[PDB]
TrEMBL record, chain C:
<comment type="similarity">
    <text>Belongs to the ATPase A chain family.</text>
</comment>
<feature type="binding site">
    <location>
        <position position="141"/>
    </location>
    <ligand>
        <name>Zn(2+) 2</name>
    </ligand>
</feature>
<feature type="transmembrane region" description="Helical">
    <location>
        <begin position="112"/>
        <end position="135"/>
    </location>
</feature>
<keyword id="KW-0375">Hydrogen ion transport</keyword>
<keyword id="KW-0862">Zinc</keyword>
From TrEMBL, chain D:
<protein>
    <submittedName>
        <fullName>Mitochondrial F1F0 ATP synthase associated 14 kDa protein</fullName>
    </submittedName>
</protein>
Automatic annotation (TrEMBL), chains E, I:
<protein>
    <submittedName>
        <fullName>Mitochondrial ATP synthase subunit ASA6</fullName>
    </submittedName>
</protein>
From TrEMBL, chains F, J:
<protein>
    <submittedName>
        <fullName>Mitochondrial F1F0 ATP synthase associated 32 kDa protein</fullName>
    </submittedName>
</protein>
Length: 51, 81, 217, 62, 124, 245, 97, 97, 124, 245
């Protein structure tokens, strides 16, 4: 069920495989604008596809 | 990726152009007056006149005139001069 | 009954977006003294209901005149705005639209010896808006007819493909007048509809309704 | 040359038919299409800060 | 046509653990959007023929009455002057710079879309 | 015999029993336009209410709006039709407009008929499925009918109340006659205190009464001044009318 | 051929890479390409004027000549500045020629 | 309504089962139905003639009257058998009436 | 679209003996021909409106010039005589007998099809 | 300099290297119409034969007929093009017509090129996929080319031979000139005895020679009279010319 959980999240949203699982909540903050921009601009461009 | 969906429908007119063309034509044919170089005559004159004499020379200019003012027909020689 | 499908980001969609947003920018809405929130939102929506659609009217007159002016530069075609009733019939119709808007600001009643002189200079706007479009489309095309007759007098008299430095200097003068006519075709459709926003925008003013009762602090 | 037309009312009504078709075509066909793709972009660019903060407060996934 | 994420969720729920990682490319492609395939030509629509016969019927009719216009050689030599600029506009207008200049007139194409920043919509 | 043949034709061909036999095809078209011409006819509307009941589950949203405001004007209340109407609305709530829902609710507010699933799907549709300035285009006599229909049925949707409170301003109440503005201001303040919701645009429905208090009683102005003090500490300040300028 | 698909591809490779500014050399004589277009333009007009005149040459000109005559005509119908006069002289000349 | 779907169903039940040959009784007076149609036909003509005449009655007839006059007219423009004569008398009558 | 008998043969070959007799109604319906379903109206086509506006534009134009025809009351009373027979033809023509009489004009509908007599094409 | 500019334009823009650069779009259109105007040009046709080879597998049947009769008139034989042509025919054999196959075979009969799969799919198409009177519309000089192409390659299809034997009559041979009728009658009788197939319409190709034997040799009339006696006992009777009337 963990493998099926992440199967749906990476079929819909495959860019999630570039934020490693241990470095994920090191990004968060209390506000959404406070989230660390280490992966924000990379996640936005991997989400736009391979072209 | 969607480029071949827009090549399927080809040319298409603007979406109400038949009301523009039927509005410009209905202004050019419903003038309410004779047709620009002609004059309405009686039926007794129209049935009695040859079609070479109903024509005016001014209304048939020469299609590529060698002298400016050449006309193709000559009309009625029965002038009221 | 089935509408056509539009690609997003088409070039005619991008051009007409920028054209509409240009003419809408000519009569901008005025900022109220209050902050715009849900209290002031019906006063802002009612302020937009009482403004004339000059953003739509000016891009109607931009797009119908630049299409007519540029027909005169297509081969085998003449500009419809080179006709007196077409071009001045658009100028009177803008002037009457401004006046009907300004007459309705009251109850359709028409407004010492000063006011016949404000009226004359205002009634001349009617004919000046259309005649400026008509004479520009006529005087540019007429000069081109005269100079093509002069530039045809040289190869008719002299040789075909002979004595070519005489006709080259006038075929390049004819070519630079058709090029100026492309500039006058675009400018006079811009000047007609810049001025339509100015004339119609004079009577584009109503009272902001606003809050009549408040709970301060 | 040609200065006055054969009918001034016929040319003035040709201008009113052409400019009212352009008014109809803009209001009905062009400007709904303009605003459907102008305001998808504009609503998303205006809401983006409050949409994402509302969604951050909602999903329990953190 | 139900939504493809509920088709992904259903197709991943009723697979086994052994064939989960093999099925992931056929659940990926069952929920890809349709991009319709490039059909055969069937060229020049019933309205593209009206647009080109009606433009040829207009150009012949306008050149017919231009040739008997009392200034007929001046009228027919103005179509040469006017079509000379249609030729010089195909050779001077930067058509890629003009295309990207009209894309900046519209705020919809002058930028990228801006919502939904991926860290707000995770499902862990 | 010309007068005899016309009078015989008039008593057997043009009656109201054949007027309701051509009206069986499309019901909510003929139901709506006849009732707008003044054709109430309580037991001719029963022929409508059973001819349309196999169709209510598949009607368009402008057909459903045409049924309810026709059956409001004819004042006829068919309870097993009006549950098929509210099951059209609460199944297609995303397709209805605030112009259409404010006329369906005012029918359901006269004929005291509600569901909890209907009251949520009307409030979900006005708030989320419709433009947020659609209350501003409504006219405040219809919004006060929606405000009391949620206070009669005890339904507190604080998201709907912030939406309907947009459509109360000097603009929307100024388009009302002062007989109808008074019937709305008292009806809107009675609903705003039933939920205890005092938005910042309650100072336009209060100020619509305090700028002309000579149309009100002292009993109704005690009702108004009860809401004014209840809204003053909620909004954190004191009421003050504005003389313009 | 397919009537819309052949010469669309022929006009495409006549429009784009068919270039007489380089295939005929022509950089030896011309400075830029912006001035090759600025006299291919005037060259198109001078060729188009000389074709339109020559395709029907014996004609009495509608335009004002400036006091000049084409060739050995000089008193004929081609150079006659009165048009009802030259219509009479053209009709006499047409029987002979 | 749906504009093609309502009165198509209304005309269908006016065409088919709406029958004044039985709803108005009328078998008491008529032998068959093949002769009810054969005088509803002639009844349609006599009604349509009398409507077309009466919808504009004061008119000088283009058709030859057989020497008859409608009502108290008898010498007016309505009965005048010379048409240029009756045009003069109608223009006089129109000022009065 | 391959043929449905090879779809029947394939679908019956790859079933088991236990679920053969249960599968026979879904192999029957997988090889039934398509009879397309009755769509919604979208009534009066773009050419049925040209046919009825153009017929109304013809009837008004013909009645316009009939009303100024010097025998105008005789012309307008002939349309009453002519339309009286269109009414009497809707009430006298046996339209079911006429339909089955035109079906006998054509030899394709005057009989039944005649080939392939079932004992020649068995597969035992 | 008017003559100089035209002559410079003529030596760099209108040549046959750019005539074959506009002819790259649709090959079998331009291949067919140029070869009918007399444009053989053996190494301009090699530019055709490689520009069309990625397209031969998807050509229509009138395109394939246009390739083969153009490459017959230009007499150019590209063996790896002509296997893609016969793989278009033998994959779409139901779509070809006898008018089209009799022109494709006569190209394949000049350039001695055949397959067994091609010879069956041409014979299956003329016999079964095409109308049985399509040989009657053919003209007997094309049917004799098909008869010998099946006798050169030793292919006995007795169903095809009964089909092609319809198109031999007094009508079809009477439309031939007597130089071409003689070249056909000898070519058809040589193929009818190679299979030993003597149909009832062999008495029209024999009788086309015996009614005018002064155009034939005694060697060729020995060839004709060999087939006449071979056909007489097959059909069970004796030959007799008919004087008309
Ligand atoms: Zn011109
Ligand atoms: Zn008639």
């Amino acid at each position: 069920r963990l493998l099926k959980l992440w199967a749906k999240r990476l079929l819909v949203s495959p860019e999630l495989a570039i934020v490693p699982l241990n470095e994920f909540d090191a990004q968060l903050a209390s506000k959404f604008e406070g989230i660390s921009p280490k992966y924000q601009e990379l996640l936005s461009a991997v989400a736009q596809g391979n072209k | 990726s969607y480029s071949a969906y827009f090549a399927k429908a080809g040319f298409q007119f603007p979406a109400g152009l038949s009301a523009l063309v039927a509005g410009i034509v209905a202004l050019n044919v419903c003038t309410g007056r004779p047709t620009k170089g002609t004059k309405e005559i009686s039926n007794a004159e129209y049935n009695a006149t040859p079609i070479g004499y109903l024509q005016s020379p001014d209304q048939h200019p020469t299609a590529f005139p060698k002298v400016p003012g050449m006309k193709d027909v000559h009309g009625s020689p029965h002038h009221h001069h | 009954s089935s509408v056509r499908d539009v690609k997003t980001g088409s070039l005619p969609t991008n051009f007409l977006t920028g054209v509409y947003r240009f003419w809408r920018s000519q009569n901008p809405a005025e900022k109220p003294h209050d902050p715009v929130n849900d209290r002031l939102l019906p006063a802002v929506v009612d302020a937009s209901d009482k403004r004339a659609s000059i953003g739509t009217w000016a891009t109607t007159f931009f797009c119908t005149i630049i299409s007519c002016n540029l027909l005169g530069l297509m081969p085998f075609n003449e500009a419809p705005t080179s006709g007196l009733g077409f071009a001045t019939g658009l100028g009177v119709s803008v002037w009457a639209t401004a006046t009907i808007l300004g007459l309705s600001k009251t109850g359709f009643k028409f407004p010492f010896i000063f006011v016949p002189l404000e009226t004359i200079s205002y009634t001349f706007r009617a004919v000046s808006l259309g005649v400026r479009l008509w004479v520009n489309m006529l005087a540019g095309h007429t000069l081109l007819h005269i100079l093509t007759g002069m530039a045809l007098a040289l190869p008719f008299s002299l040789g075909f493909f002979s004595m070519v430095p005489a006709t080259f200097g006038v075929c390049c003068l004819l070519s630079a007048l058709v090029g100026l006519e492309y500039l006058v075709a675009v400018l006079q459709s811009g000047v007609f509809s810049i001025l339509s926003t100015v004339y119609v925008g004079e009577f584009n003013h109503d009272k902001f309704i606003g809050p009549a009762a408040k709970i301060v602090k | 040359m040609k200065l006055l037309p054969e009918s001034l009312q016929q040319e003035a009504a040709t201008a009113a038919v052409v400019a009212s078709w352009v008014l109809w075509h803009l209001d009905t066909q062009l400007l709904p299409t303009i605003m459907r793709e102008h305001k998808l972009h504009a609503c998303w660019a205006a809401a983006a800060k409050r949409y994402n903060e509302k969604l951050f407060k909602l999903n329990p996934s953190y | 046509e139900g939504n493809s994420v509920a088709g992904i969720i259903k197709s991943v729920n009723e697979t086994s653990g052994a064939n989960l990682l093999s099925s992931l490319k056929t659940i990926k492609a069952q929920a890809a959007p349709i991009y319709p395939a490039a059909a055969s030509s069937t060229g020049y629509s019933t309205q593209a023929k009206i647009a080109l016969f009606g433009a040829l019927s207009w150009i012949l009719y306008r050149a017919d009455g231009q040739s008997k216009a009392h200034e007929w050689i001046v009228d027919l030599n103005l179509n040469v002057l006017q079509a000379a600029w249609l030729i010089s506009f195909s050779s001077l207008i930067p058509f890629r710079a003009v295309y990207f200049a009209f894309r900046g007139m519209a705020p919809a194409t002058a930028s990228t879309l801006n919502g939904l920043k991926t860290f707000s919509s995770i499902s862990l | 015999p010309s007068q005899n043949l016309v009078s015989t034709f008039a008593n057997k061909v043009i009656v109201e029993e054949n007027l309701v036999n051509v009206a069986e095809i499309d019901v909510p078209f003929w139901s709506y336009w006849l009732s707008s011409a003044g054709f109430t006819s309580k037991d001719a509307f029963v022929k409508f209410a059973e001819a349309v009941k196999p169709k209510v589950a598949a009607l368009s949203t402008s057909d459903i709006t045409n049924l309810t405001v026709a059956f409001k004007r004819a004042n006829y209340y068919d309870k097993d039709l009006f549950t098929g109407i509210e099951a059209n609305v609460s199944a297609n709530f995303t397709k209805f407009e605030t112009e259409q829902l404010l006329q369906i609710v005012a029918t359901f507010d006269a004929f005291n008929h509600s569901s909890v699933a209907f009251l949520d799907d009307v409030a979900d549709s006005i708030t989320y499925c419709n433009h947020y300035l659609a209350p501003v285009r409504a006219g405040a006599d219809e919004l006060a009918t929606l405000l009391t229909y949620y206070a009669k049925n005890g339904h507190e949707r604080a998201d709907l109340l912030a939406t309907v409170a947009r459509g109360f301003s000097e603009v929307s109440l100024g388009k009302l006659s002062a007989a109808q503005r008074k019937d709305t201001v008292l009806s809107a303040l009675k609903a705003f205190q039933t939920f205890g919701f005092y938005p910042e645009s309650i100072e336009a429905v209060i100020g619509a009464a305090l700028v002309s208090p000579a149309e009100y009683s002292a009993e109704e102005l005690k009702e108004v001044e009860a809401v004014k003090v209840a809204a003053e500490n909620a909004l954190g300040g004191e009421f003050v009318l504005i003389q313009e300028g | 051929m397919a009537v819309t698909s052949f010469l669309g591809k022929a006009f495409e490779k006549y429009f784009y890479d068919f270039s007489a500014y380089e295939q005929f050399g022509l950089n030896r004589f011309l400075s830029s390409k912006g001035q090759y277009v600025a006299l291919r333009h005037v060259g198109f007009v001078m060729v188009g004027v000389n074709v339109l005149l020559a395709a029907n040459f014996p004609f009495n000109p509608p335009f004002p000549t400036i006091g000049m005559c084409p060739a050995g005509w000089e008193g004929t119908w081609v150079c006659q500045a009165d048009k009802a006069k030259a219509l009479e002289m053209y009709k006499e000349w047409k029987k002979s020629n």
